[model samples]
Every structure is written in C-alpha cells, then in structure tokens.
Target: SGFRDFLLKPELLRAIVDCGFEHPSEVQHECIPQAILGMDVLCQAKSGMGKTAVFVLATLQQLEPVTGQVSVLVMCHTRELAFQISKEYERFSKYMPNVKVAVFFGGLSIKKDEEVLKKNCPHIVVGTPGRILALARNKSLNLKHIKHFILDECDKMLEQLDMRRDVQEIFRMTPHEKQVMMFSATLSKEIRPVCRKFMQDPMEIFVDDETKLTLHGLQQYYVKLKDNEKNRKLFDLLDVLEFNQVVIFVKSVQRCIALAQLLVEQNFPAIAIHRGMPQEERLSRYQQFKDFQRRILVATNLDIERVNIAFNYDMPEDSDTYLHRVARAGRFGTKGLAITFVSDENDAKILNDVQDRFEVNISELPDEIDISSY
Candidate 1:
C-alpha cells in the first residue's frame, strides 16, 4: 500500500510524495499507523531500517499551528542526528509551509536556540538531551504544550547514569498526557525500565527479518591480516574488491582521520568523519556522501549505515559491536556488504565469537570480490 492509504492529512501525504518515498519501509509500515493513532511506541529496529522516517512522518501528521509553545519535542544523542532529523522534517513539512521546525544541540549556541524558540515558537523541535534540559531550566523553552515527545537512540542516551538523569528531568517538564515514542537500534535491559516509567503500555514494534532484507541483501566476509598490516591490506583489498560506495570503520577519533588521509592520499574520494571533526564540517561531508557525490568514507564506529558497504578497518572489541558494525550496511533488507580486516589473535577470537554468538557464517574474502556494474 502507498503512504496515502494511511489516511494521513493530505498535506502530509503530499509531503511524503515530495520526499520521493513511494512506500513505507517495514518499520514504517508497522509503526507509522500506530504512531499516527497517537499511541505511545517503544520500537527496536536495526539501524538503516527507516526508523527515523517512521517517527518523523508520523509527527508531521500531527502537526498543528504553534499554540505559543512547541508541539513536538525530539531528543537525539548527537547534534548531527538532530540536524539530520530536522532536515527530513523540513522536506516533509513542505506542504504545511507555516509549520516551524527548530534544531538544538549543546556544542552550538544556547543563546541562539533560545532566540529561535522565542521568535519562531517552532511547532517541532529536535535537539540533544543536555541542551534541551538547559533551555528548560533557563526558562527560555517551554514544553508544557508539547503533543509528541520523541527520543532517538534511547539506549545510548540512557546508558550514562548522568545523561539518564537529564533525560528523566526533560520527561517531567512535558505534559503527563503527551505521547512518548522511543526508537533505537537496540533495547538493553536498562532501556525497558525507562519506557515503563514514562510510556503507557506502549505498542512494541519490530521489523521482521524477511521484510527488512527483501530489497537489500548482505554479503559478509573477513580478510585476515597480521599485526600492523591493516593499512596495507585495506589498500590491497580496496584495489581488488569491487564496490561503488565504501565506509571504513575505526575505533578512535584519531584513527578515523589517519585512515581517511591514507585513502585520500591514494586518490580515493574519501572523507573522514568522527567526533574529532567540527559538527558543521562533518554535516557537509555527510550530505555529499549521502547524495553519492563522494565514494569513500572513513569514520569512527558511528553512523556507518549511510553507505552501501562497510569495512571494519579495526575489529570491534566484542560480538555485539561486531554485529552492529556490519549491520550498518545491509539496512532494512537493502543490498549491503560488510568486510572485516582481522588482525592478531584477539581479532580472530572476536570474529569467532560473532559467528558462534549470532549463529551466522562469515566467509573468507575472495581475492577478487565482485559487485554489480554501474
């Protein structure tokens, strides 16, 4: 069925059409209608499964003229995510041109956020937990009238005891009756209590495996490299393996830049992204990559899903991390590929753990890994 069948406001339906998404992804299919019905949602789907769009489009369905305060509040773990969500909102809110959207995060100016909130009285606001809490404290932002409260990457936000406190405080500021929607890549044990504490018997939604991968297939493999051989082997593999888009994952901010430089030096259209880079710069590069303007991306283990292929330049320390890293590519049942550069005994053990723990096979990479021609 098309998005129009959901009986969304015509304005919203038009916006969806404008965004070029003809049908909802599985997560969107199962959850969007429930969300549109104003039910509290606790959703867990792997990254790249279109979870963000589900909530973004749903919230837009409920859009109303600002009644002197924010009507929707979205909390994200990072500035870039908040900004990205805001951009999506921008496209989806096109029909309702008067609908105001504001994005806030900590590293940027709090004063500026306050200024926008006061002037625009934005109907939809996406922000990080800490900055949202700060504005609420300073009395510059008011959430008392908020109708939809969203938390993206809830597990990551709740993992820190201190950050959890800030999030809980934000919850208190909003109306008791406002709908709560929590979405993330994982639902740790700690995440359950937070949902139970605030949400009212939320509808739990999951993207079926077959549905997620119907459009995309994932091929997973490992390349064995000895100590200090990762950089050289990475180059060698990139040379022989065929791919149009690539993401190289490292574990540290320093290494993200270093590896990206190596790729660029070799004349790959590579861009490195990590916490070490400024938010604005990262956003620029990310936009270029998403549009398929750039071919290769190097980054920390964060946000790897934006690419079609993911290379674990540095092996993740644990099985769960390993799974998440690879899952970045084969998103929502899309055609994706993941390759891990295994170095040292520890990496081998980690790969072994990943296979045994997940009950999945990781093949040894072929000398010439072939992909479809452009």
Candidate 2:
C-alpha cells in the first residue's frame, strides 16, 4: 500500500509535522484528503478559521513537487491574504528542501516579481483578482497545467465586489480538468450561484464545530442614531475606542481615499487602499499600513471577508455590511471591535438583525456633531 491513508504522503507528512501541526483541524481533515485525490470540494466555513491551513496542506500533498507545468493556484480576495497564504505554504512545506513558491500581487516592485517569475515557475500561485488576472493576461503567468484551483472567501468575492467575472476570466486560462475548491464563511444565495458557475459536480463537504469558522475573534457593536448623527458618533467612537490601528470601511474607492485623507488631515495616522490605484502601489501602501508604518486606512468590501484587526468601521449606508466588516478583526479567535454607525432611518431593521444574529446587545450613543458639517 502507498502512504495514502487519512494522513498525507510520507514526505508531505514530515513537511506538515515540521510546521508544528499535531493533528488536522476539522476543515483540514475533511478537505485535504479529497483535494489530494483531485476531487473538487466546497466548504462553507467562517473567516479566520483553519481554511488556509487546510488548502495549504492539501496543495502541498497534491503537488509534492513541481510538475512539468504549474500545479496549484490559490486565489484569495486581497493582497494581504494572498501574501499570507503563500507564506504559510512555505512554512508548511519546510521539510521539502528548496521548495519553490511565488507571491504575485500588484504593487511592490514589478522588477522583483519579474525576477522571481524568471527564476522559477511557482509550484503555487497566490494573489488578488486584478493582479493575478493581469499577470495571466501578459502571458507572464501560465496556469494551463495547474491541477488545483482554490478560491478563498468566495461569498465576499462574488457578491460584494462583483469579482465573479474576473474569476471567470482567470479560470478560462486554466486547464479544463483542474480540480476547483471553494470556501466561504457562509453561503448566501448570491454566493451559491457563483460556486455553481465554476465547480462541476463537486463533492460538498461540511466540517462541523470542531473547527467552526465563526467570526468569534471580534466584538460586534451597533449604535442607534438619527440619520445625520452617523458621522458625529463615528467620530466619537473613533475618539473613545482604545484602538491602535483602525480601518474605516467605505463603499467605494473614492470614499476610501477621501475618508483616509480626512482622517490624516485631522492628525490621525491613516492610509487608503482600494482598486483605483496601480496594483503595485496599492500593495506597497497596504504592506506599510499592515506593518504599522502607517495605521488607520479605509477599505471597501472587496472580498476582504476575513481580515485581522481590532476595529472595522462600517462607514457605509447599510447594516448588512456590518456582517463582513465585523469579520475584519476577530479572525481566528482574536478579539477585536466591529463598530457600526446605524442611523435612525431605513436601515434600523438591518441593524436589529445584526444584533440578533450575534445575540449581543449593542451599546447606544446619542447624537453629537456631524463631521460633514465641519
């Protein structure tokens, strides 16, 4: 018999063990084996769960070595997650001496990326939507031989930013027989349709509470306010919270920049990251902010369902947005704050639903000065 039990192949086992994983998380146990066997799988798990680890292990096991062509493509919703995903892949495959890996994102140095791609065809390709698609467009990336296509944060990618079209374009460049694995915190009708578009007769695998993808890492706050009071209380909450770094989420790229600039002019450390700028520049700024060279950026709901932060400011008009916003900080058992400025208008019911979903009472702050009037 081969080294093909519930565990990974021997070499892959050593590589995984070297990474300090005593046992697989529930998601890992369910998803990895099927992925290694070349069966497409769909997982409806929450953010900050062990989904990345599952895919990393499965990818390493399936593509233990670089084939004549590319073997794996792990696409995520953001440069931050893509970068982190590749790093985790390197960490897990440590036992494999001289393992080849590549991170393809916009921003950073094109010269550097060009250099890396020249040196080696990455056994695994990870990056955000625009950058990855752009790479494939230039023929700089060849995904035709890719055996595994993993999509992380599917719900947010499809619904929030309308990323399905881009994803479809990328998939067209890949091999037809490739096994596609999709993951989401939860499945909405909007998300299911997209999954159906790519995955064909996939084996739907559900991993239960042993590794539930609950956004338990963050605290959820919804404040009741009058229509004009959102800005004022948002300002006050920013004033009162003991946050080291905060990301105020807006609805569009322009808003992200405008909000970030407004905060900066107010003497707050802030940056803005969105789709409007060059990919490389956006990535560089995002890294700087993530590394704390700057703090307090504004973002949109662009497939960033599971980000790590203590504060996610939903500076938008809807309450449904708080669902994804709350996911930013509290990933993977880390506690953070999700502050929503729900004005006293049409979105009141949505705010109530948010509170009911988490079974937590939202703290209320009365109206104060409107920031726009300033």
Candidate 3:
C-alpha cells in the first residue's frame, strides 16, 4: 500500500526505504506512475512535497543499461538546485553502479566541465539552462540522443526572457521524441501556454488545494515596524523565540551578507547564501546550516528543509515568492513558524496581497507569546 504499490525497480525501492521514506507524498503518488509510462507531464505542486522523488524514481526506472551518452536531461533554474537534484539521483541510484550523473552550472569553469565530460560521459545530466545551453552550443555536450527532458521549477526557469530563450533553445536541441516533464510550485497563466507548447498532450496534474496551497502546520504572523526599527525588532524576536534553527530571508546579496555579518557580530552565529557568492562557498555554507552546525541563516533565496522558523527580513515582491519562502518551514507536516516584518506601504500591500491570495490570515504578533505553540 506504500511505495511498493508503485512497482518501482527493486534497487530504487531499496534506496527509498534506506532514505526512510515509507510512503509517497500526494504529488509522488499521482506523478510517478504517469511519468514511468513515458508521458509528458505538467505537474503543479507546492515546495517540499516530494516532487523531486517522483522524477528521480521515474527516470531511474526507465534508464537503459548502456551509458555512453546522456539519456536523461534535467534542468533547473539555479546552480544550487541542479546540485541538489544530482545529489538526489546519486542517493536513489546507490545500487545502480552504471548510472552516471553529471551536474553543470555557471559558477564553475567551463573547462572543468569539459574535463569531466571527457573523462566519463554521464547517463543523466542535471544542470542550469545557461550552462547547459552553452555546452550544447560548443559541442561539449550532446542533446540529440536525449530520451527524457525534465524542467524542475519551470515557472522560475521561464520567468526572465533571457532564461526563457535559453530553456527554449535547450529544449529544441533535444530530439523531438524525448519525453518532457515540467514541475513547479505555481503555474501562472502565461507560463501555462509555454508549458503546453513544450509538451504533446501532457497529463496536467494539480495537487494543490482549490482556493490556496495552505501550509497547515505553519503559524504565520507579522510585526509592523518603521524601517529603522526592523533590526531591533529582529534581535528582540530572536531573544524571545525558541527555535531549533531560523532562516532570515533578505532581498539581495549585499543585504544578505550585511545581515549575516551583523548577526555574527551580535553573537548570533549565522551564515549567508546568495547568487553572488562562489558556488563552492555557497554550498559549504548551506551544508553547515543543514547539518545544524549553524543556528541561523540569511539568504536571498535558497531552499532548505526542516527550518523551524522563516523570518522575512525583507518583504518579498510578490505573493508567490512569499509562499515559497514561508514553505521552507513547516515542511512535511512539521510544526513551524513564519514571521514577516512590515516596514512601509509597499510592504503592507505585499502582505495584504499574500493574505488575500493565499486566503489565510496573518495576525499581528501577540504581546503574550507561547513558545510551545509552534
């Protein structure tokens, strides 16, 4: 009645059990079977809902024994995500010795990528669009033989014109017979057309609630403060709140670095991650936070799981970003908290929009705090 019902490869089932996932989440339950059937799938699900596993399991099931050229091409918007996806493949393919995976992104040298590819061709390639397209253009990577093409976080991948063009180019480079799978937390109307254009009668799977993707286990609250008072309020909240680990969301690399430095100077011990940092440095800082060696993290936008609290140090520009940021907490039905600091009319408007769009109330921080509630 669990993962066994899906009838995945025995190696994959073993790895899933080793990873301690006894049952598939809703998205996985609906998507894995369809994806295994070689259907083009356009899936909409919230973050931290085991969407990655669906693709990993399905692709692993369909892999051929031969491994000279890439058969599966998986693309994501960011270097970190590509790295994480490749890691998932490695974890799930523990018993698959012949399954090779290579992850490519922009931060590293292209020459290094070339060296890796020449040394041994991977069976599954996971990377960002810019790097993937660049490699395909230079003939360092071959896409003609690709049997499966996957777009993770497709909405973000298609958000910017340049990225959209790169993704389109990459898609066109692959054979037309290849299977296409698109995954995202939110699928906008404009993006839907692009997704439809990429697939042929794709099975549209929506696992979200009708009104909103409500985070049931997360307690959302906000504090209204002047621009100058935000720092003091953050310190006060940190002092009072009982949290295992906290993630502070900022709007830019400069702010992320400054805030993390300030937190460390104030004896809070924190790390920061953003696009500006070198890939190796960013990955190490992320690993430290994930290992719980650091109790606080500041970032522009990077997904980490099992965070006890998500602090919106700077209000996000849109409701979708707000949802993604808060979803970092309360993952997998664990109890978590989200606190947003509102400083201006724009911030207030964004907060109101988030509340209205998600159909949930974000109450003011109460005077009497109950630490046990979270």
Candidate 4:
C-alpha cells in the first residue's frame, strides 16, 4: 500500500517494476511520500534498508526531463557508493531518455573526471565529499542549476568522515530554494542540531534498528586458535570458503604484506592492497580481487566497510578491528561470512564490541582444531 499510494511516474514505475521490486521497504514507504512533496528530509535508516532506492527515486522524480543544467548533487562516504549510485541512476533513467549522471570521486584520474564535467553539465552529480568540495573550490564543477542535495550514509558523514564541514558548503553553491535530503544508518547526538540548522522543517524517518534483514542475511563465523594456530586457520579458510572473493583485514600495511607473502609462497593466486601500493596498483589489485582474478585479499582497515566479500578474515591485533572488517559482508540482503581468526592459547582477545554489535557469539567454536594450534 505504501508503494502504490504514491505513484512513481509511469516511466519510473515501469523501471521499478522491471527491476522486480513488488513493494517498497519500510524506509521507502515513509520517505518517498515526503520526498515527492519537495520537503527537506533528514532520516536515519539502517544500512541496506532502502535509502539508496529512496534517493534514487527521489532524484529521478525531482529532476526535469530535459537537462538544461545540473539538477542534483549527492555526496557520499565512499567512491564505490558514488559509482553504484551513478549506475543505479542510469538504470532507473533507462525509461527517461536523454538524462545524464556523472560520478566523480577519489582513487581515479581527476583530469578524466574534469573532462566529463566540462563536456556536459551533469544532470546528477554524485561524488565523495572531499573530491566534490575540491572541485567546487576550483570553480570547475558548477552547482548553479542544481535543485537537490542528498547526503547518503549520514552518520558516517557526521562522525567518521568529518564531512559536515565540507557538506555545509554545498548550500553555498546551489540555489537557496533547493531541496536537501540527508540519510544515515545511525545518527549521533550532534547530527540533529546540524541537520536542523541546514534543513527547513525536514521530515525525519527511522527505518529500523541494527537487527534486521541487514544482519539476518549474514553468515557469521569465528575461529578460535592459539597464537601458533592463526596462520593455518587463515590458510584453510582461504582454501575453502565457498566464496567468489574474500577480504582479510590485518593490523597494518606491514601485516598485509607479511600475510600476502606467505600466500604468494604457497601459490594461492593472492594479492595485497595497502597504503604502500601506488594508487594505480591499489586500484588494479582492488579490481582484481573484485573480479575474482585474485580470490584472497590482505589489507588494512582502509579497504574495509566499502567493498563486497564472502567473509572477513580478522587478522587484526584484536577483536576491535573486526567491526569494520565484518561489516564488509551481509550487505543489501546478500549473505556473507565474518570469520575472526583468534587462537585458544593466547586468549586475551575478547569479542566484546564485535559480538555485541554483530549479535553473534564467538563462543560458537569450530570442530577439531581447524589446522592445529602448533
């Protein structure tokens, strides 16, 4: 009823139905109705609940059919999400011809991105906060004709990203009458005041708590081994995880190299992605891992929280790092395993935050020493 109540234009409706979405998620039910009215919206919905579709549809519905100038600006926490939103925009806009969207973010050639922006003003521009801000400063990216500003992953923007400072300037570039929508999985105490100052009479929507299809669809696992047994567990997991690709999170760039070295010696067809690697190498290895060219990846926290993988190998110094690592899997209703490689002998590692956050017990031990504590 929520989905059917507010009619997406026939073009959007056709595309939504074509994508096989029979109904809207909880967030969509509440947010879409408000968005259609051109109201400022500040909502916190748990990850993968439906905010992506909310903004995608909202952007599509808000923009005019003809691209006289850029109409929308979306700043996100990661480049991957920017690319994803751009792809989704193209897919949703398939029914609406002659519309354009551009995704500009870090870890790619800025010159090339400049070329795209210069050639034709983007009807929709989604980018990382820093990249978008830098472009705005140079006067290379224009916001004169923009009408919508949607901040995806709002909590990350406020807390982890330090993007609020940069995001504030977004209003300066756009027309004063533009509609602003901010979304996140979690909103800290400060986010409310921040949003209140920026948004006018915004509609607030909360989708669900952390426990939902987000974690329900996840395959959670933990490995308990002594210090001596950690390596074997890592090897065995890599050998047979039944995954298209895998990500192993270590404590530092040095550890990533150490683990990657062992895998290389064993001829596991693995790769290492870390701070030391050049941007080109990092991107190449990243794409290689994503394309399954190399099924195993070793990296620091920098690579986590943004990519897809079958499982997380918690190669960190402690369970604390497992938060970002395990967050890698079980995204968008897709299930994934989050495995922590802890040992039995060296038992200082307690799964306090990781267990509580994931709502799973690491006490669920494995059968027979996975690969011998020796």
Cα RMSD of all models vs. native, in order, equals: 6.6, 10.2, 6.6, 8.3
Order of candidate numbers by lDDT, starting with the best: 3, 1, 4, 2
Q: Tens digit of lDDT per residue, candidate 2, span 129-241?
A: 77778777877778788888999888777765556788889998898887899888877666776677788999887665442224454555567666466556666666755
Clashing pairs in 3: none
Across residues 1-374, which tens digit of lDDT does each residue of candidate 3 receive? 39888888898888886665766788988898899999999888877777988889999999885656889999999998999899889988998888999899999899988888889989999999999999999899999899999999998888878999999988888899878999998876479888878999999999974234456667899998887888889999888888888999888889888898989999997989987775446667877887899999898875337578889998998898888678634235466789998888999999999878878889998866455442
lDDT of 4 by residue, 129-241 (tens): 88888787877887877788898887777675367778877667778887899988787657788778778788887767544223444555666566567778777766654
For 228-288, candidate 1 gives per-residue lDDT tens digits of 8888888876776677788888888988888878788888898878966654566678777
Which lDDT value does model 1 have at 276?
67
TM-score computed on alpha carbons, candidate 4: 0.59
Runs in model 1 lying further than 4 Å from the true structure:
211-374
The residue ranges of model 3 lying beyond 4 angstroms of the native Cα positions read 209-374
Full-model lDDT, candidate 4: 0.71
Which run of 10 residues does model 3 get worst, by summed lDDT? Answer: 327-336
How well does each candidate superpose onto the true structure, as a TM-score?
0.62, 0.55, 0.62, 0.59
Q: Give the winner by lDDT.
A: 3
